[PDB]
């Protein structure tokens, strides 16, 4: 059956869910998740790779398997660059978030000093 | 444009760290490269003598 | 709809970092060194 | 006294700085000339106009004449968190539409601008810049990696 | 020959492998061991004679070793370890921006702070403006 990768959204050929939070990966890529991080991906929770279960159980052209390799190999680069290109977008975002935030807290602390005034005039 | 400029990163990732161990790793792979020769030099000797030997077996 | 507010929110903060507009996106410190430490190992 | 004495004054003097500079957030290179003009009548006017103030200490470090408290700043927050509702969640449609700004909003004439608004030939020659740039980024990349290569 | 042995460490001329260990041994060796202790060195289960095969090369058929370094095995072997730190490079990204897109839509108070600075400075104004 169609099973799908929790770390790549892709279709796998070797669907594993951990049982620390039940999702389903790549066998390998959550064996190097683990071997990096430690924990649950999705659940970040301590796991090791006994705590996996295993689920259930063409050719066409070598010239053309070669440049679908190609155009998918420049889609997966495209997407890594939108992906750092949209996180400096949104850090750019929250900081200015974060300006205007200390910007009005400072407004509301001055005005709220000023106001005192009007109870001595 | 997009695609290329993540290759090009991945590719300065593969260099530098090919830098660090580039050099250990080829010269690893001549040291068991070398093996595989004098390995084969010694099975191409010991087969020679035995076709040799064959030769003396027959004039004998 | 939403669409407003982000618009302009977003407009506000491209405009606040309009000099470094002409930087490519970085490589965050965390994701170079997993992808090294991947590759070392 | 240069322990706890001043190990109270490095950490109390950064809390009054402001958030981007504590949780080491972006900030602009330079400030921008066009992010402090205001109609000097609005709120969001006075909050622009202290907003430029923030950037210089950050930026340029050119603190502010006044400086306030942490329990001030804080004070004043709390009026704000009080007050403010409707905060929205997170969902597949703000991801569309945030997607759908980044595609859609590009600088042209100096300034940044819907793209759909500009007149065709304006068009054509800001994704013109827009891909020179990216054919900079990746120059910039390939003589680096040459250099590389090479030895 | 290539193969060396796991627990003489020499490289041996009389490679036999074992069932149980999955491992290489030289014959001399291993036979005393069953003879003396019964056992493999490595897993400590049985060894009996019979679980233990001769390893061999050069055969009718056997093909040439690849020594040039290239192969299509281990291209297709590092375009797929490419891959694996490509996805785990983008998912960590993907959570990055999940976080930071998150808090950035919950803060975004900006609009009720500035209603609050108007009735603010209307209270002032009007607090002021009286005497």
């Keep these: 059956m169609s099973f799908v990768c929790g770390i790549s959204g892709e279709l796998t050929e070797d669907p594993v869910v951990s049982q620390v939070s039940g999702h389903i990966f790549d066998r390998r890529l959550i064996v190097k998740f683990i071997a990096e991080n430690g924990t649950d991906p999705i659940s970040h929770g301590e796991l090791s790779e006994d705590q996996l279960v295993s689920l259930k159980s063409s050719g066409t052209s070598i010239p053309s398997l070669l440049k679908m390799l190609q155009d998918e190999w420049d889609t997966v680069m495209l997407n890594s660059f939108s992906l750092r290109q949209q996180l400096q977008i949104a850090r750019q975002e929250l900081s200015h978030s974060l300006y205007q935030h200390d910007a009005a807290c400072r407004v509301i602390s001055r005005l709220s000093k000023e106001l005192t005034a009007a109870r001595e005039a | ?60 | 709809a939403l669409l407003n507010q982000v618009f302009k929110s977003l407009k506000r903060a491209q405009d606040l970092f309009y000099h470094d507009y002409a930087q490519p996106p970085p490589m965050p410190e965390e994701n170079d060194s997993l992808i090294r430490s991947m590759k070392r190992k | 006294n240069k322990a706890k004495r001043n190990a109270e004054n490095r950490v109390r003097n950064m809390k009054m700085r402001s958030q981007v500079i504590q949780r080491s957030l972006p900030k602009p290179t330079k400030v921008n000339e066009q992010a402090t003009r205001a109609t000097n009548s609005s709120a969001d006017d006075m909050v622009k106009a202290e907003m430029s103030k923030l950037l210089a200490w950050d930026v340029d470090n050119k603190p502010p004449s006044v400086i306030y408290s942490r329990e001030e700043l804080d004070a004043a927050a709390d009026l704000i968190k009080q007050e403010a509702e409707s905060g929205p969640e997170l969902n597949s449609l703000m991801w569309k539409v945030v997607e759908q700004c980044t595609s859609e909003i590009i600088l042209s004439k100096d300034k940044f601008t819907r793209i759909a608004i500009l007149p065709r030939e304006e068009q054509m020659k800001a994704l013109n810049d827009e891909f020179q740039m990216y054919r900079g980024w990746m120059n910039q990349r390939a003589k680096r990696a040459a250099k590389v290569e090479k030895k």
């Design chain 2, 1 to 60: 444009a997009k695609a290329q400029n993540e290759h090009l990163l991945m590719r300065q990732i593969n260099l530098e760290l090919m830098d660090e161990y580039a050099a250990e790793s080829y010269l690893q792979r001549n040291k068991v490269m070398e093996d595989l020769l004098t390995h084969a030099e010694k099975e191409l000797r010991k087969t020679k003598e035995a076709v040799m030997e064959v030769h003396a077996n027959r004039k004998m």
